[PDB]
């Protein structure tokens with residue numbers, strides 16, 4: 001199953017440390033996030049929101065970039081990786097109307113998204129889910145986990161990405177900061 | 182809503198003319214296809230199969246190709262376009278493991294998918310739905326409609342595509358020929 005749900009509520013594997021509503025409408029503060037490898041039909045009664053997305057095929061990375069990523073990408077659930085961040089992201093209609101070469105050029109040629117990100121592996125385990133096609137309010141769910149010693153580096157990564165040409169097309173973004181229970 | 186379901190059975194807006202089980206397991210012959218804008222969990226007991234997929238963003242076409250397509254592409258639902266063909270397609274695992282530059286290279290540089298297809302517009306209207314990400318048995322639902330005068334031209338297009346490098350990665354394919362009721 002390539003579908004995952006993130007339920008904000010009073011149960012889950014992750015305790016919410018804080019929620020930062022970076023751009024556009026935020027997400028209601030909750031105690032925990034519950035991650036499930038499947039679709040959940042309705043938001044539970046005592047829960048505040050449900051996000052969902054699916055794992056999918058590569059859209060932009062070229063073979064040499066994939067080879068570099070797979071060489072350093074860490075697994076999930078490392079013993080030391082007790083911190084995580086869930087960052088749902090929505091991109092603008094102007095982004096989605098662009099052609100494939102236009103979006104690839106902004107993504108890598110102009111913003112160096114992969115090249116910049118590669119600097120912060122193997123410290124940071126990063127994963128991507130897609131959800132525009134499900135009709136969700138966000139387009140992507142991005143997931144990161146790392147040990148506390150890499151907290152400052154991860155903030156530096158965020159600083160760099162938010163200044164990139166690609167981020168001129170981000171129109172909604174929320175950070176859910178988490179600690180493993 | 183970008184989700185569409187295709188229910189093969191006794192009712193629908195389209196009459197089945199024939200089903201050509203081109204490659205791999207076919208689809209049961211039915212009287213009609215009912216097309217619904219949205220997901221459907223269950224189908225009538227009278228129905229034999231359900232297909233589903235979603236409309237999505239461009240994955241391969243570059244700006245100059247989009248410009249050429251927009252200049253000649255017809256709209257769906259032309260009064261004259263009383264014939265349609267629903268062609269579900271599944272590509273191999275080897276295809277999906279490839280990186281984005283590798284798949285683009287096969288799609289256009291080697292197979293001339295868009296260049297060949299442009300030769301059959303404006304006669305043929307077309308739409309692409311995606312469903313690998315939904316866990317479906319096919320990867321794509323492709324849709325084509327045209328006036329009867331263009332049936333032989335469409336069959337020629339099929340012949341040219343099935344001979345391309347890209348089609349060496351197609352592992353399941355069915356043609357559901359339809360007439361608008």
Ligand code: HEM
Nearest residue numbers: 057058059060061087089114117118120124126140142161
């Ligand atoms: C930590 C190191 C990172 C690496 C190695 C990395 C690498 C990548 C790669 C290779 C892709 C393209 C996947 C594809 O071709 O389908 C991608 C997509 C994406 N990443 Fe990153 N990334 C990193 C960090 C981040 C961060 C910090 C964020 C958000 C703050 C982020 C948000 C996204 C989004 C939204 C996409 C989807 C882009 C689109 O399809 O338009 N990534 N990432």
Ligand code: HEM
Nearest residue numbers: 238239240241242268270294295298299301305307321323
């Ligand atoms: C009739 C004229 C046609 C034109 C102008 C055309 C053009 C295109 C274009 C530009 C794309 C890329 C869409 C994107 O970038 O996301 C595409 C994708 C596709 N087309 Fe066609 N095409 C035609 C006919 C056909 C036929 C006859 C078939 C099957 C029998 C077909 C099957 C597909 C499939 C399966 C894809 C998705 C490829 C993938 O994502 O791997 N097309 N077409």
